[model samples]
Target: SVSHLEHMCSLDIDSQTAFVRLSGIICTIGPASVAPEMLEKMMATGMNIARLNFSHGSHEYHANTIKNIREAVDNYSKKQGKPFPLAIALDTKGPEIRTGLITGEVELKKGEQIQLTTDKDHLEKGSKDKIFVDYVNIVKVVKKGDRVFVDDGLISLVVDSISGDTLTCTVENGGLLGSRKGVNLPGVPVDLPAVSEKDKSDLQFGVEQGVDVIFASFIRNAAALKEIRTILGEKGKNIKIISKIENQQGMQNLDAIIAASDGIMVARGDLGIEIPAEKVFLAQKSMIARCNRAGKPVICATQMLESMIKKPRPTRAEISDVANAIIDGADCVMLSGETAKGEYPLECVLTMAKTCKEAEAALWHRNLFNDLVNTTPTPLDTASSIAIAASEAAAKSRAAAVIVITTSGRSAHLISKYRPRCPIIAVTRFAQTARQCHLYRGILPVIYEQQALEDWLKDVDARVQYGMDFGKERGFLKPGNPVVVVTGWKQGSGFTNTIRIVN
Candidate 1:
């Protein structure tokens, strides 16, 4: 999804035009996917981000995926002689309800009075009579007149009454309700923890596995973020919390949630069911603009390459959707079942990459309000100025690269917004930010805790050396080459100046 190169590059370019690199969301490994060689090929196709979905599979499976990804990265870097970082984002499954096992597939009829129970072994021939829900407290939580959606909101029902531990409901939309169908209670804030017991275990497992960011699912408000933050504590303070806005409540309180979140994901799959599909598009645009204005990274996830999951190509509507999100300023686009369980996963990724490249080229740069500098210039001003000067100096010198020393990753991100010609080396003290920078183009992120001027100088020197080594490796540079060095005057602060010279 995020790896769609088509959306990023121009189709008019010659075949010799270098393929624009892209990022892919890797969710699972199966017969069609998940081999070490397959992983390497995916990375070669620009699979920069690996997503570990906590909803399915055990922790061991995710751990193995991480190992495989690292091995691929190492192998690729060994050939290139320079390492490239791949971000590992752990997607945590939040509290949700589903149906229990049925004796067989049952079709509910409209106007039918159905009794929904939590009895695990209870089975009925028809969905209209004595049907069972999976959540233990579903009946206890539902009140008379409450609405419930089943099977991804395919079937709707209104609660009639609660007798004992069973809920009697009038089926509004009759459909084939089968076993293990998902359930959703709109407008009813069930007294459930945002993080389920399963989610907590999965999160702990993810932290142990050293995930770069935690994609907190079903994030409704700031409170949910604080809860997860408390659970993670210091080790994960820097770990980006990408709140997945799937519910109406999350959208209503999006501003607050986005402010608190390191990043936001417009997860339209569940969102489309929660709200009208048309409204979801508008919400996505609004969210992307908001996040872009706030200088926070946001992703448009779900269905970007859905058709490619089965077919070799995506539908016209899907292509338009992906392109529009990029124009709306989404930092990244995502793939789910398309790459994880799709028949042509690599082809799907390549298509997405090409689409993104084209979309980016076609994008018109808007006139942004320069008001960001109007705020208290104490820190942001300095950072902003440093970024501009570094970019200009790099352009003038025709440097091979520019290095930025940052702690918050803010400096690096601000610099990236300028879209410098040369690569940007984002050296950071924190690994989480380092990993998160993979979403940005022309950025090579690294982590080192030391906050000394000499350490930063060393990084600059290393970049120059890398460029020289690469040129030699490719027969481009012989002995000497010019490179620019940029950094902050004070250690650990944002960069403030730039120097250009011949190597």
Candidate 2:
């Protein structure tokens, strides 16, 4: 059996071409990996989406990154002999509560009382041991007996009481704190808007820079997503949105948030901090199922290979974490510090790619996805019925891949929601539409250039013929094999889709 598959692989395409992996990789680019050559090398390894973390970076720097990435696209596309540009995702920093900058060396002495100002710049002078708080309404949200964590929980401040625009905190735990330390009010709900002024500024610039996806953070409700969409106005309509599930409120309102956004990210770092670590994996499992049901992508982010940030090899546990996420059916797994500031970014990517492939094999052999995919079968419209037909045809014919030529990515999205076992090779005329599919679990986006539309009958026929040629050339379809191709045909009413087996 192994010998036959290998023999087929040898004759299917060029001998040197890489194997097509099902699960995708989302790599964050930063000081460690932003160089044009470096980024391209990572893409060659298996990075599908390039994420820009707006938590740190100037507009000029971010704009240069955009420019560099576009340059990288040309560099990579030529090298690969395909139009394979990695999707650009801008990850916005949410509303942050931070500690004020201090003049001299400051330490929160154990068993001492400190005062922090929700007000900044016009802050009151420290009465010997008071620290400054940057939140404007910090006093109103947090009360006595609340625990505060500073600088990644390196120091702990217990709230004693609030006194006239100031928070009086007891330092149960103290540490050396320099300027600009972060503050975390775990489980304490802060009265804040989802989109901050700084977030708005960064978002506008990001859209101008051709960012395809926005990873909206601190998403507590559907209104939060609605706010971002309203702000996008006209120019950003095509940009995809990913809701970051961070806190308890976000977890509680998860279903609503998932419905509103294009995708969901299991922001496990803050999520773990917000909830118990043992239950964090439970949330990850639950969210992935919900996303699959909605036909939306879900990404498992943070600490997939955290120890590899400095080490040459990842821990056994880290490898298991990556593989297990794949087994749980995440469309994409993200690397934050591992690629953003890691010493071995390439190795981390290679390791992740390897583990993903192994887990995908496990997923394929177990026959585990059928029960999970059952929720999508109930038909509501022609789109769903045609999508169901696509999966049916692909499975019946054992097609190498399901091919779709879409204008707005509707057919691709619908077919993907059905979760066909065959890889969905989605061809799109628009660049943004292709980017939107990056997070899709088994969907592969191929950009079709110089898109000229023909009439309905001719269009469906021509597109399917071309799709067969493409699938065969890309090693997804054998020369004599059949492929299930789906195309959108415009009607007086709306677009009714079709699924055809073209040999």
Candidate 3:
């Protein structure tokens, strides 16, 4: 079996030219990429998911972007003569602390003393001496020697002493400060509620707009996700909730948070400040590994290609970062400012896609598969067993693809976890199901628009054939290539119990 597995692995290694990327790319949509033409270009390039950041845009601003995104997908699908589905994710602003308005830009010098006050009188006249922060209990929660980071951590202030309603701080790090900049008080137990008033309004807006996923920011515990789920209620039940782990409490409650949410995001931007920057990689690796074991998709985000926002090319370190994220078992890698407001959005995606394919090709599938199987808890469920069998059969037979007839996308998700060398074609009736499959690695979902036939077996064959044809048309399969097909037995979800091989 070692030799057989080696043969399978070596065969793909020799023909690397035809390898397709398994990892997904999520491009944040912003002013730079809001146009339908630009969105269409990014989609055709490699963007599997489009993210709308609710922090910066108004309801009408995002509504127009959503319309443009759908139009782009429709236009692209028509050109390809098939449905091209792109998932839209709404990123919540979450609960944040910010400095109030500044008269003009204030030059904060290192080693200089400044006063931070929650007094409303200084809100508009915030200066080098007195800066107004919006959080009311800032003075109550923070003690002397606490650090405050502003403008994405470019400026840092250490609390020297506290007087009523004001804090005297020495600037440890300094830069030009602007009005209404975000404030980060790392390691402080922020008493802000899980969802802010703005976040509630945005969540409701996402439900009304029928978003595919919600990237809930600063998720500290399982209860936060539970609260948001209640807000989503019945209408947004199908929308996936991806908890953003960017704080100390989140990492402390990681297991419970993973159990509660549909997915996880290693939001490394704020997380780096929340914890030590040097230890962020440990958090990324651990979070991704846990999400992988739990069968939930994990996304790596924040400053992945930050330099590409201005430059035509990303730095060498950025390339390696993207590659390592893929090798670390991240189902999807996200672009924040790089694609959202970058000068070279298309180039950034193309570069990321290329890096992902190369990293995926470098993986040792057999060893990875064996390790995943060994680590999984015993007494595998029926569907999981079939998924394992299908993955093994695909590798041993060197099948072109494994086609799965799924209603809810669980079977495809299971097979993806096993890290099969070839693609997993998930045939589904629902467009949302097809779109959401992009969150899983190696799953190429094909939607069957036709109604189910009267005969169950006939309907199954038709869907399987549809998947097979998709692969063939896309050059993922050859005419005489061996194919593995999986389907349900009782004609509904949770009944995926059959696997067949065809040539």
Candidate 4:
């Protein structure tokens, strides 16, 4: 019945019925969407997170972008007459391998030869015959017969010889080579430092800027996350870290990295190059499923709506990609250039939002609940028990929505992990917690503006009523509908032990 209601809402979106998107949308802030007006439009269109990619911009530029984000968010919040905190995430560049600058695109024919060098003299002098790569110890790490992929595997070369700081290679799969493209040496014992010096500075900047999350790129090991934690120090201890799994090394240490990280990102761009392209889906599925079991957020990112970067509409395949990501249990779906530098940033967000709503409505919650509860490890804690009980109650009663009182957003997170069919309204006092709650699936975060009352029970009821009102105003809850409420026995975190059904 809930599914039918959701399906009907999705079909009649322009009417009084409003469709709620359970999954979060993360849009990269760049040249196109950096303007306050554009960003405000994006926020209105449902960009839950604003991602700052540190791979390209300067600190001063990024600071301005952050300013614009807050400005836009303030505008949107004022319009809504409520505090809407749009999460800011710093996407670190990590230790990436890239080709040096080139004057123009060069065509490399298959069976021809080219040379890659680490010499700084050729940094800006790259040509068809010789190209500069920034990785200093490239020759030491790569050997003859290894394959080198350029621009995300668009061009490939097989190493024929290595001499000094240069590698002479025969083009195996050639294409037009452009400036500053990403390079990947698959299966080479890449000894690059997990956190480069630049990444350290960027992380320090993010801390100073008060970013809610860090999307650390190319996280090869759990120790990389430790190093990042060290960089964050005391000021950023609360910032959530979402590690991007981009290479084979990350796959090898998947569990460790997942354990260390607060969340995971299936970054399939460079990941597709490092391994077989056909295998990227396998990794996406495994990473998403594992993170779900761990009760950690996972993002399915990169190229979900790439074609929409220039065009107003996404291709049919791109539509399916976005939908499948939601069906696969991804907490958030990200857009890189699609919103950052795309011509149709607004259209991209709207399209993604619509597809997510449809995909969410189509999910079979009965089977999903069974799979999630049975797969979770034994000896459930009090919070987990409450979450499961609440989800079951919602399913059995077909409640209009599940309203939760949370300070740290843990109870709502657990309920989200159970994959309930209805929306989970996470009511929290802390603005940051409310914003970060968007990273979890099915949680509609609501910032309770009022101060806590001396009587804890009254405060609980107030927050629950606020959540109910939030759902009602948004048309998520109809008049006189039964709703499930989840709350803690005390004021602090980790005490969510109560659930009730209320009208």
Candidate 5:
């Protein structure tokens, strides 16, 4: 037996190497990040997704950026021979209110009383001293003592009384006023429609563009999703919708909103102004936990690296904020102004990627994850419970890989919710299912062509073997090591329904 085995080493490869960092980074594509050159470098440094803000930028500009994004991915994939998918998210500017025609910048002092009108003809033209609001029914909905925020909360006003067409207001915080700056009413419902005409057009445009995700801002209830879906009709079902929680009404309606959204984002900047600073963290943790339990990805976003807009590195407080988001079980952290308009965009992405990977690597491979999961057992008769078992089984042997054969992509996401350290090989017969599940935290989707396979058991067995081979190519598996395989017995069947640990 001077055989080939004489020169071989012990085949145990560390399982930590197989795990992709559980949390990912989402960067807004703007002037700084949309350049094909800049996008490639950002993607090279662990950026998983791109967010397109519809609040600004023309439709033509967004269309160009989308083309550039696809080109950038194609270039990167050609260079690397295999491309990890990048998700495209379009953010809609939901029903918003703004101050209409104010004559030049008016200097209002603190503790001064002023008048605001919503009459369409409030001014024959722009004039000083009095301002017109864009919303037609402002006086009908707002009462005395309502707090109004203008210029993104820089100037504050309290309504003293409402007349037929005008409201007398006392300026609590005063600043220079400009026409068309936005308005917000904290804790008061303005009775605005959930979706605007502009949003419907933008939403339809996104569907046509085949965007991977859509972020609906200022959502009030689950009902809003139905309204949006009706607007999109048949072709928009594949796009993901992310609900942004920004104010008190959204906070009170959190559970209903969570159930409606495909994902959630903790929009802290606006939320900070709407709720007290002390209560913000409580809400963040609660919302993130809820999304995690529901198997939906949660994004902690806005001003994450605000200082990085001008500075090379973040402040100590900012560093703690990003790390805490990961530890709190958020699946992704988003950078808005920092990556969009900031001078140090690349450095910001690198910093966030490093922080999230370090934080996840430190805690997840140990018993911390297992401890949190094992304490609360999932109920059987659902896809999630089967996923829970696969995760636990993979951890038990420190297995090389977790192989899953999925049809609808639900089983893959459920496995992702458990946060297993091993790489997941999610083999699907449908291409759409592969693209959909690849955005989840730990999944690596493999599209398997199965139209030729007539034997049911052989199909599962062959795919399990194929998953291992793909995993090995990715360095996710090695010989003689146990790997967890989850598959369906019948062809095109799942809920996973079965899991086997075999070498």
Candidate 6:
């Protein structure tokens, strides 16, 4: 039965109100709702991004979906007379361990001592004597007092002892176990390749299908990132990589992994298994705050609407969780089975969009803006102070441009936050920093060749002259224009100290 709230609120904008503004992004797709019309309806319902999960669908299926999405966007652009930059993300299937298929659904009673064998061909013959795991090293990796979870963590078991090819575990929950259920070994590090054979094939297919970003699942460390990068290489087509932190190792190596990747995803399905449930909330908050401070996009994923996957409306607790993620400063919120195979996939997306907008609107003045600005630490206390004073002086002197010399791109981002009317030119010797500045709005990055101090100064002056020569370019400057120049006194210090005005 559809809830009243689900039907009362229309997904489309109406005469009484414009569409609610959504912070961050929403991703949706699946067999039940991957048609051209359905994709267009989702885009209209505030879906800024689309995700393609490589785990379930075939390459041909994903390719058709991508083509449909592109056609929808083109049609939208034709009507709106403006292009919408909808990001299409391909989520890669990383290493995963699963149990072998049972002859039929089997039920396990609590307090039962079950022997898990890694024999690939083991079959159960109406006997609960032994269960089979597909991974060959399940027993070899287990020790006494180790915990194992299965079936999306619905059932928990603890290892009591290990023999040659089998390990005995005490079932902690009584549930029906089906074929090919997922297994999660939190503490024990499984020696599996980061990119499985299946993943490699999916990645190649995704690249051919023109995915904008790659959501790498279960990324354990920096080496996993590099390995994916190596595989993508020149053929990768410059797609961004978003590392999904699903395990403890990924969380432990968070900083290094985030630094190497383009973005991060706090994938909570397996994350909750690796860490305590209560601790998962704190981890999500910390990861979102960290990503915001770094100016990289972060997504809060997994089970946002687990209940709504079947029911028409989410439970109160689920609504609060989704709302909290938005208020807590996530760049995006994601849906899994709710939008993939749910009976109310469209309803789920609509409800989430409404809840996020209402929460953000209510807290707009109270903390959202302030949180966005205050969360960042000043690059250099002294340098930031000096830069502000220089900016004020330039404003009083009617400056044309604000020039900042930086290597790490921090000095320029600081000045950008101030929202100065004059154009800011960020000069750097490194090309990577220059390109990265594109992420920041309203900052012009200038890449230069390495040269002697005098040569560098001469090159700067020449560029300024060229800007002043073109009237249109010089429009950023007036006649007798005064511009502020900021740089560090020490070489390669990245500290801001001196300021000058050019006439």
* RMSD score of candidate 6 (Å): 9.9
Please give the range of 10 consecutive residues that has the lowest summed lDDT in model 5: 1-10
Put down candidate 3 lDDT per residue, 1-503, tens digits, no spaces.
36756654564445564467888999999889998999889998999999998888789999998999988889888833567767889989999888877746889999999988989999998888888988898877887777889888888999999988888999997999988887878887777888989999999999999999999988887778889999999999898899999888888889899889889999999999878899999999999999888888999999889999999989999999998999899999999998888889999999999989988877777777888888865998778999999999999999988998898889999999888988998988898989989999999888888888988988889888877778978889888999899887786568888888899
What are the lDDT figures for the candidates, one per model?
0.69, 0.78, 0.88, 0.87, 0.78, 0.70
- Candidate 6 similarity to native, TM-score: 0.71
Winner by TM-score: 3
TM-score for all predictions?
0.82, 0.89, 0.94, 0.92, 0.89, 0.71
TM-score of model 5 (CA atoms): 0.89
Residue ranges of candidate 5 with Cα displaced over 4 Å = 1-19, 79-83, 123-128, 364-379, 429-432, 447-462, 473-481
Model 2 lDDT per residue over 306-397, tens place: 99998999999999999899878798999999898999999999999888866665544213335544665654766767777777788778
lDDT tens string, model 1, 1-503?
Answer: 12236434534555332233222233444445567788777777656687767778777787787787777777876655334667888888787777766645678888887877876567443355777776776665656777788888888889888877678788897788788777778765556678888888877776777778888888887899888988887776667778998877888888899889888889898888777767888889889777765666788888787788788878998888877777676777777887678888788767677777666555432222233333224545565777756666666665656656566777767666655545566665566677778765456665554334556556655644554554456443345545555555545455446544555
Q: Which scores greater on lDDT, model 5 or model 6?
A: 5
Sort the candidates on TM-score, descending order: 3, 4, 2, 5, 1, 6
RMSD of each: 5.4, 5.1, 2.8, 3.4, 6.9, 9.9
- The TM-score of predicted model 4 comes to 0.92
Candidate 4 clashes: the total is 0
Residue-level lDDT of model 5, residues 230-285, one tens digit each, is: 88788988777888888788888888887888888888877877777688899999
Query: In candidate 6, which residue ranges exceed 4 Å CA deviation?
Result: 1-22, 80-82, 123-127, 361-503
Residues 330-396, candidate 6: write the lDDT tens digits: 6578988887777777788888888876654433322333444456546646755665566566557
What does candidate 4's lDDT look like per residue over 95-160, in tens digits? 888899775688989999999999999999999999999889988777668789988789999999
Which residue pairs clash within candidate 5? none
